[PDB]
Design an enzyme around this catalytic site. Structure first.
Site, PDB file in Angstrom:
ATOM      1  CG  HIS A  55      83.688   9.469  16.420  1.00 13.77           C
ATOM      2  ND1 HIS A  55      84.184   8.451  17.253  1.00 13.77           N
ATOM      3  CD2 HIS A  55      84.119  10.622  16.971  1.00 13.77           C
ATOM      4  CE1 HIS A  55      84.958   9.016  18.147  1.00 13.77           C
ATOM      5  NE2 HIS A  55      84.932  10.333  17.999  1.00 13.77           N
ATOM      6  CD  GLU A  68     103.199  17.293  15.341  1.00 15.03           C
ATOM      7  OE1 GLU A  68     103.937  17.798  16.172  1.00 15.03           O
ATOM      8  OE2 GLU A  68     102.643  17.911  14.442  1.00 15.03           O
ATOM      9  CG  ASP A  81      83.805   5.346  16.091  1.00 12.86           C
ATOM     10  OD1 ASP A  81      84.153   5.710  14.977  1.00 12.86           O
ATOM     11  OD2 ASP A  81      83.880   5.971  17.147  1.00 12.86           O
ATOM     12  N   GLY A 115      88.809  15.140  21.814  1.00 15.59           N
ATOM     13  CA  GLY A 115      90.122  15.510  21.257  1.00 15.59           C
ATOM     14  C   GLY A 115      91.018  14.293  21.246  1.00 15.59           C
ATOM     15  CB  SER A 144      87.796  11.019  19.043  1.00 17.33           C
ATOM     16  OG  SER A 144      86.813  11.168  20.070  1.00 17.33           O
ATOM     17  N   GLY A 145      89.832   8.526  18.336  1.00 22.79           N
ATOM     18  CA  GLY A 145      90.549   7.797  17.312  1.00 22.79           C
ATOM     19  C   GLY A 145      91.964   7.355  17.728  1.00 22.79           C
TER      20      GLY A 145
HETATM   21  N1  AX7 Z   1      85.352   9.137  28.606  1.00 21.78           N
HETATM   22  C1  AX7 Z   1      85.200   9.715  27.432  1.00 21.78           C
HETATM   23  N2  AX7 Z   1      84.176  10.546  27.126  1.00 21.78           N
HETATM   24  C2  AX7 Z   1      84.384  10.930  25.861  1.00 21.78           C
HETATM   25  C3  AX7 Z   1      83.643  11.785  25.022  1.00 21.78           C
HETATM   26  C4  AX7 Z   1      84.141  11.954  23.699  1.00 21.78           C
HETATM   27  C5  AX7 Z   1      85.329  11.336  23.257  1.00 21.78           C
HETATM   28  C6  AX7 Z   1      86.080  10.502  24.122  1.00 21.78           C
HETATM   29  C7  AX7 Z   1      85.561  10.312  25.417  1.00 21.78           C
HETATM   30  N3  AX7 Z   1      86.039   9.556  26.421  1.00 21.78           N
HETATM   31 CA    CA Z   2     105.380  19.514  16.574  1.00 21.76          CA
END
Ligand code: AX7
Ligand code: CA
Length: 223
Positions: free
Chosen positions: A40, A52, A84, A175, A177-178
């Site tokens: 995604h 970082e 995913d 934010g 995600s992944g």
């Molecule tokens: N618990 C939770 N809800 C989310 C919604 C979008 C991305 C990661 C997430 N983790």
């Molecule tokens: Ca930095």
């Protein structure tokens, strides 16, 4: 990350930030040339940021590398979020050091009750918006299959697991995600989805990495 703590500079040396003029998704370095992330999170023109801590300041240990190739899993379903996972190849090999390191793939699946570390630069507010500039960390247990499926009826596949607290207050969020979910030194999950963040009886949903090792190893070896 909601209800977590400041990790500290380069404590999670495998954590990657995917940038496309701004930070949009987390990832994990699996070797000097490859990154695993969420399907995604797919986008054209990704720049991989390694080593970082503060994503808004050049602190000295970063490696910025363009992506050469992106591979979404062949059975990724954007509607259900089933499968995913995606693989990102770096234009040139990263230099591994004390701050930039790879995470190993699991040889087997983690059981419920196993403690994991979840990391990212995502929203820190349950219901509000506050983005950190520094890497946030969260220790959380893998939940039982049954409590995961109870929270999301008919949405959980064999390729997903829940982790967190049913009481709420601590979870991953937008934010993150992944991003990596590491249990006993192996990458067990990828931040995938959920319902809001840190809501009671609505824990985070993660891609179950142990189901994709063959696919990952074969893909990397042929690309
Ligand atoms: N618990 C939770 N809800 C989310 C919604 C979008 C991305 C990661 C997430 N983790
Ligand atoms: Ca930095």
């Amino acid at each position: 990350i909601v209800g977590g703590y400041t990790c500290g500079a380069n404590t999670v040396p495998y954590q990657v930030s995917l940038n496309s003029g701004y930070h949009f998704c987390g990832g994990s370095l699996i070797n000097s040339q490859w990154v695993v992330s969420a399907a995604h999170c797919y986008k054209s023109g990704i720049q991989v940021r390694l080593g970082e801590d503060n994503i808004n300041v050049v602190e000295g240990n970063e490696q910025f590398i363009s992506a050469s190739k992106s591979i979404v899993h062949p059975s990724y379903n954007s509607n259900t979020l089933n499968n995913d996972i995606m693989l990102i190849k770096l234009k040139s090999a990263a230099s591994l050091n004390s701050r930039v390191a790879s995470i190993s793939l699991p040889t087997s699946c983690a059981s419920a009750g196993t403690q994991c570390l979840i990391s990212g630069w995502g929203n820190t507010k349950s219901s509000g918006t506050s983005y950190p500039d520094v890497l946030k960390c969260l220790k959380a247990p893998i939940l039982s299959d049954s409590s995961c499926k109870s929270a999301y009826p008919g949405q959980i596949t064999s390729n997903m697991f829940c982790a967190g607290y049913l009481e709420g207050g601590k979870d991953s969020c937008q934010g993150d995600s992944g991003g990596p979910v590491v249990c006993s030194g192996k990458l067990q999950g990828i931040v995938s989805w959920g319902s809001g963040c840190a809501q009671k009886n609505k824990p985070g949903v993660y891609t179950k990495v142990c189901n994709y090792v063959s696919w990952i190893k074969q893909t990397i070896a042929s690309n």
